Amino acid sequence: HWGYGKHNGPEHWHKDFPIAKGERQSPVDIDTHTAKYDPSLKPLSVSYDQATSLRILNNGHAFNVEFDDSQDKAVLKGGPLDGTYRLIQFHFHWGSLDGQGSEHTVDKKKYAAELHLVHWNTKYGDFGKAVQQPDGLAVLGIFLKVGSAKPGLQKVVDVLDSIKTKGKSADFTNFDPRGLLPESLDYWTYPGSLTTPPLLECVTWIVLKEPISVSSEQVLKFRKLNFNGEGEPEELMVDNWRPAQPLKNRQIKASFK
Amino acid sequence: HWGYGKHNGPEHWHKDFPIAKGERQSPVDIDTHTAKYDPSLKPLSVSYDQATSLRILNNGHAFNVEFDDSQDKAVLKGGPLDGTYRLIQFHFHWGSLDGQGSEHTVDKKKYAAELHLVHWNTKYGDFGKAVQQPDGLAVLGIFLKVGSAKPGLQKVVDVLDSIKTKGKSADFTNFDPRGLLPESLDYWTYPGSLTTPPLLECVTWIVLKEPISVSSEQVLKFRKLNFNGEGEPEELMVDNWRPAQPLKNRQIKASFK
Numbered sequence: 170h171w172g173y174g175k176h177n178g179p180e181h182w183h184k185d186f187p188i189a190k191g192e193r194q195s196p197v198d199i200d201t202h203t204a205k206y207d208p209s210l211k212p213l214s215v216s217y218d219q220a221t222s223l224r225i226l227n228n229g230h231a232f233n234v235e236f237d238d239s240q241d242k243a244v245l246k247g248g249p250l251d252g253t254y255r256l257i258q259f260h261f262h263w264g265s266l267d268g269q270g271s272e273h274t275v276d277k278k279k280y281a282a283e284l285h286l287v288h289w290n291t292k293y294g295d296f297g298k299a300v301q302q303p304d305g306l307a308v309l310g311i312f313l314k315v316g317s318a319k320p321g322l323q324k325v326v327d328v329l330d331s332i333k334t335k336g337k338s339a340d341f342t343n344f345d346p347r348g349l350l351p352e353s354l355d356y357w358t359y360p361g362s363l364t365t366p367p368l369l370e371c372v373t374w375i376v377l378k379e380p381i382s383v384s385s386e387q388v389l390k391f392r393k394l395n396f397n398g399e400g401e402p403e404e405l406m407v408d409n410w411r412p413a414q415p416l417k418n419r420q421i422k423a424s425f426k
Numbered sequence: 427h428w429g430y431g432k433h434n435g436p437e438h439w440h441k442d443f444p445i446a447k448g449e450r451q452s453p454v455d456i457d458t459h460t461a462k463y464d465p466s467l468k469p470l471s472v473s474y475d476q477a478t479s480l481r482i483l484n485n486g487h488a489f490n491v492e493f494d495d496s497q498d499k500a501v502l503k504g505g506p507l508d509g510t511y512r513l514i515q516f517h518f519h520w521g522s523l524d525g526q527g528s529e530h531t532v533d534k535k536k537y538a539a540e541l542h543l544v545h546w547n548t549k550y551g552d553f554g555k556a557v558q559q560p561d562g563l564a565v566l567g568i569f570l571k572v573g574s575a576k577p578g579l580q581k582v583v584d585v586l587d588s589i590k591t592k593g594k595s596a597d598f599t600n601f602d603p604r605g606l607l608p609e610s611l612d613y614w615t616y617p618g619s620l621t622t623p624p625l626l627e628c629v630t631w632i633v634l635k636e637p638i639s640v641s642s643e644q645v646l647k648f649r650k651l652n653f654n655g656e657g658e659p660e661e662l663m664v665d666n667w668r669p670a671q672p673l674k675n676r677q678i679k680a681s682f683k
């Protein structure tokens with residue numbers, strides 16, 4: 170029964186998931202002056218041309234847009250990564266107000282929301298096996314700020330009415346995640362973890378420097394979702410972000426000067 | 427985006443909810459000289475000894491005090507009712523000034539506010555199924571006039587600061603709704619509807635004749651609530667009442683002579 174409230178939120182998670190106090194937890198604050206440029210990092214390769222989305226699900230804390238990951242259709246490669254990582258799902262974290270919502274921060278700046286594109290390393294065969302490995306996942310993180318609308322996001326926001334409450338799903342085919350990417354692929358990278366329970370330390374984080382812009386009306390529709398099931402008292406799905414965790418013995422690398 | 431303003435208030439609701447012009451809409455004016463005494467009505471049975479409140483919520487138009495309705499703990503029976511109705515929530519409607527705020531009127535008299543205790547018929551299993559039935563709900567309505575304070579109301583007014591804006595909730599356990607009841611259970615009854623969208627024609631209305639008294643300071647605290655979300659321009663939550671609707675082919679019955 171973990172969640173984001175006073176009695177079950179991030180400060181409680183360590184009781185059920187002791188790794189919450191581990192050595193490579195996420196998210197973190199990105200200190201842009203301390204991050205070091207690494208000229209040995211390769212360009213990021215984001216190959217989403219054959220992506221095939223299947224479904225969208227309200228899982229009780231956010232919503233996941235799911236993909237067919239049974240062949241290499243949508244893959245992340247290059248950058249800090251060795252080998253091939255297949256897209257399985259994306260989701261967001263967001264706030265109750267525009268001044269908060271992101272998980273990562275940039276010189277302590279919080280964005281209104283953060284998009285996570287989750288990928289698993291094909292050398293481990295399946296997602297479930299991959300999360301047991303220190304290099305099992307690669308998450309592409311993208312900040313959202315409020316300003317102009319993101320056209321490529323509108324098909325997501327218009328389906329949210331149909332998955333308002335916990336446990337609802339809807340068909341969501343033919344969704345192109347390329348419409349959620351900023352112009353630049355300039356990034357920061359560090360070794361970390363899932364930001365939700367079970368908090369497994371299996372993620373290579375790749376956080377893009379350039380935010381995308383979404384409109385106030387688009388993020389308002391996120392905030393009309395519900396944490397609760399149908400027929401239960403309404404609890405708006407807002408503030409589903411974990412705050413920054415201690416960097417400990419890690420270095421954040423920059424792909425750019 | 428229905429509400430109570432000039433451009434989205436009760437006179438607009440029929441566009442989205444055509445039943446607003448239906449044959450059994452609420453509230454109504456209670457013409458006390460036309461209501462007929464029915465000696466075949468049984469005494470009302472209000473059994474609230476085991477009620478267990480859980481939470482209070484600002485839903486953007488009023489606030490709801492919610493109950494655990496997963497067993498028969500707080501039930502309404504008798505009167506005009508067949509079977510057992512379980513308490514799910516209560517809320518109020520109120521005005522900007524003491525001369526208005528009630529939904530029902532009594533010989534055209536408007537009270538400062540009106541309390542609605544909402545109950546669903548256990549034969550339909552859940553609230554959501556109950557509102558689809560002509561005998562699905564029973565609402566106990568109680569008028570508020572301004573005079574002496576209502577001691578049993580003060581725990582509600584003191585929590586309102588913590589739910590000032592739309593979408594906020596707070597724990598609200600151990601609240602006894604018996605402290606909101608007048609001495610007499612003398613009532614009027616008629617078949618009607620929800621008074622808010624979706625305006626479903628599923629309610630047996632039971633309106634008590636005896637008002638309760640609340641102090642000016644108590645109703646002032648209702649009027650400090652906000653329709654708006656946090657960080658938005660302030661719009662005081664006042665005048666959240668629907669005016670009287672046409673009686674059409676209905677009879678109001680009185681439990682008393």
Ligand SMILES: Nc1cc(Cl)c(S(N)(=O)=O)cc1S(N)(=O)=O
Nearest residue numbers: 233285287306308362363364365
């Ligand atoms: N399965 C999963 C995997 C990752 Cl990697 C992440 S996150 N937030 O670390 O990207 C979140 C989730 S989920 N669906 O529990 O929110």
Ligand SMILES: Nc1cc(Cl)c(S(N)(=O)=O)cc1S(N)(=O)=O
Nearest residue numbers: 490542544563565619620621622
């Ligand atoms: N759910 C509900 C049920 C009833 Cl019955 C009524 S009322 N005003 O008819 O009592 C009001 C509401 S609510 N929460 O939308 O204001």
Ligand SMILES: [Zn+2]
Nearest residue numbers: 261262285364
């Ligand atoms: Zn995430």
Ligand SMILES: [Zn+2]
Nearest residue numbers: 518519542621
């Ligand atoms: Zn009401």
